[PDB]
Amino acid sequence: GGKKKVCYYYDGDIGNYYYGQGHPMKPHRIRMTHNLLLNYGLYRKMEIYRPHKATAEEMTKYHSDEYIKFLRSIRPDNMSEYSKQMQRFNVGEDCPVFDGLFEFCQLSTGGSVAGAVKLNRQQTDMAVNWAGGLHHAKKSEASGFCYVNDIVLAILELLKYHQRVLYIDIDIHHGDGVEEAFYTTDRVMTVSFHKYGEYFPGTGDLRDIGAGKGKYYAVNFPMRDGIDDESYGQIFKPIISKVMEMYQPSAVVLQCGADSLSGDRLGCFNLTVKGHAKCVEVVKTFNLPLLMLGGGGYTIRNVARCWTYETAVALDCEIPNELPYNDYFEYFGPDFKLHISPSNMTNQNTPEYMEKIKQRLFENLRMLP
C-alpha cells in the first residue's frame, strides 16, 4: 500500500514534568525516545510538529466542566484548600498534584487532537503522539496516572469525518476509560489486550462486550503473566483481521503502551520490541488512517527502544541494532543495542487458553450486522 506519510508530535517541555520522588511514571522517557530517534536520523523521513496546548473548550468535549476547572486550579501550594475535590476527582495518590500539571495535560492532549485533525484533513496517513495514550482518565475522574483522556478526545475529533473508528490497545493494562466512553455506541469499537486478574484497573473481562447500541462493540482479551512474542502474535493478527472484516472502520487509533515488554517495572509480560512492534506492522497493513499513541512504560530504556523502533516501522525504515550515540547513551548499557531479549519467566498463557479465548471472541464478532 506504499510507504506512508508520517506526522510526529513532540514538545521538548514534556520531559521536564515530574510526578514526584518514587513515582514510576517518568515523562522524561518521551525526551529519551525523541533523542534516540533523532540520532538514528528518522527526522529526515517524517514531519515533526510541536502540538498546541489543548484548551478547556477542547477538553470539555468529553470531560466535565467541574473536573477541568479543578485541573486548571489545583497546585501543590493550594492542595489543602481542595481536599474534598481531590478525593472526588481521584487526585493525590496514583495521580499526584505536581507543578505544571494542567500544562502537562494540555501538551499530551494537544498532540493527539492535532494528529486526529491532520488525519481528518487527509494531510497524513499516520500521526504519532508518544506523549499520548492516557487510556484510564474518565469524564470526571483521574485514574492510573492519567488526568485527561487524549484518546477519547482524539476519537471524538475523528468521528466528525469517520462513521466508524477502531481503537486497539496493546498496553498491558485494560483501556477502561476509552471503553467506558464508547461502551454504548457502535461508532467506536474498542479492542483491548491486557493482563487480567489481581491487576490494575480490575476491568476488561472477556464477558464485557458493550451495552445498548454498543453491544458486541467492546472486545476484551484477558491474559495471564508471561506472554511471549509467539503467543501474542498468534492471537493478535487473527483477532484484528476478523475485527477489520466485520467492523470495517475508516480510521484506527492504536495505543502502544510499552509496559507489555519483558522487564517492565510494573508489567509481567515477556514481549520483545520486535513482538510489540509486530502489532504496529499488522495494523499498518490495513492501509487506514492511523493515530499511534504511547501509554504506560516504566523501564524507560526499553520504552525509548520500543517507540523508536515503532516510529521506524511506521516509516518502513530499517535501522541498525547498534544504538547510535545519544544524550542518554549510558541508560542503554550494558549492551547498547536497540532490541531486547525475553526473560525466562514462565508463560502462564497456555496455547489452549489462547485459542479458547480467541474462539469466544470470534463468536461475539459473528454477532455484528
Ligand X SMILES: O=C1CC[C@@H](c2ccc(Cl)cc2)N1
With a CB cutoff of 8 Å and minimum separation 6, the contacts of 12 are 31, 34, 50
Instruction: Give DSSP secondary structure letters for 149-176.
Output: -HHHHHHHHHTTT-S-EEEEE-SSS--H
CB atoms inside a 10 Å sphere around CB 100: 14
At residue 274, what are phi and psi to the nearest 5 degrees?
-60, -40
Minimum Å gap between C-beta 260 and Ca ion is: 7
Minimum Å gap between C-beta 296 and Ca ion is: 9
Minimum Å gap between C-beta 38 and ligand SHH is: 25
The catalytically annotated residue of 34, 136, 174, 194 is 136
Please report, for residues 196, 244, 269, 364, the alpha-carbon distance to residue 172 in angstroms, rounded to integers and kept in the order given.
9, 22, 7, 22
**Should residue 200 be labelled a site residue for ligand SHH when binding is judged by CB under 6 A?**
yes
**Cell representation of residue 235:** 492471537
Residues 197 and 240: beta-carbon distance below 8 Å: no
Instruction: Give DSSP secondary structure letters for 265-327.
Output: SS----B-HHHHHHHHHHHHTT---EEEE-----SHHHHHHHHHHHHHHHTT----SBPPP-T
Give ∠ CA 166-171-175 in degrees, rounded to 5. Answer: 55
Binding mask 132-151 for ligand X (x = CB under 6 A): -xxx--------xxx-----
Binding mask 272-301 for ligand X (x = CB under 6 A): ----------------------xxx-----
Binding mask 30-59 for Na ion (x = CB under 5 A): ------------------------------
Stretch that binds Zn ion, among 159-167, 210-218, 254-262, 346-354 (CB under 5 A): 254-262
- Using CB under 5 A, pick the residue from 31, 173, 194, 276 that binds Zn ion: 173
**Should residue 17 be labelled a site residue for Na ion when binding is judged by CB under 5 A?**
no
Minimum Å gap between C-beta 215 and Na ion is: 9
- Using CB under 6 A, pick the residue from 51, 110, 132, 144 that binds ligand SHH: 144
**Cell representation of residue 64:** 466535565
**Should residue 175 be labelled a site residue for Zn ion when binding is judged by CB under 5 A?**
no
Binding mask 143-172 for Zn ion (x = CB under 5 A): ----------------------------x-
**Should residue 182 be labelled a site residue for Na ion when binding is judged by CB under 5 A?**
yes
Can you tell me whether residue 188 is helix, strand or coil? strand
**Cell representation of residue 37:** 530517534
- Please state, in angstroms and rounded to a whole number, the distance separating the CA atoms of residues 138 and 135: 9
Asked about 174 being catalytic, the answer comes back as: no
**Should residue 217 be labelled a site residue for Na ion when binding is judged by CB under 5 A?**
yes
- Please state, in angstroms and rounded to a whole number, the distance separating the CA atoms of residues 363 and 361: 5
Name which of residues 240 to 299 contact ligand SHH (CB under 6 A).
257, 259, 266, 295-296
Beta bridge partners of 141: 138
Of the pair 214, 257, the CB lying nearest Zn ion is at 257
Q: What is the DSSP letter of 184?
A: T
Residues that bind ligand X (CB under 6 A): 25, 27, 29-30, 108, 131, 133-135, 144-146, 294-296
Catalytic residues: 136
Residues that bind ligand SHH (CB under 6 A): 22-24, 94, 136, 144-145, 171, 173, 200, 257, 259, 266, 295-296
Binding positions are 22, 26, 169, 171, 173, 182, 185, 188, 192-193, 217, 259, 265
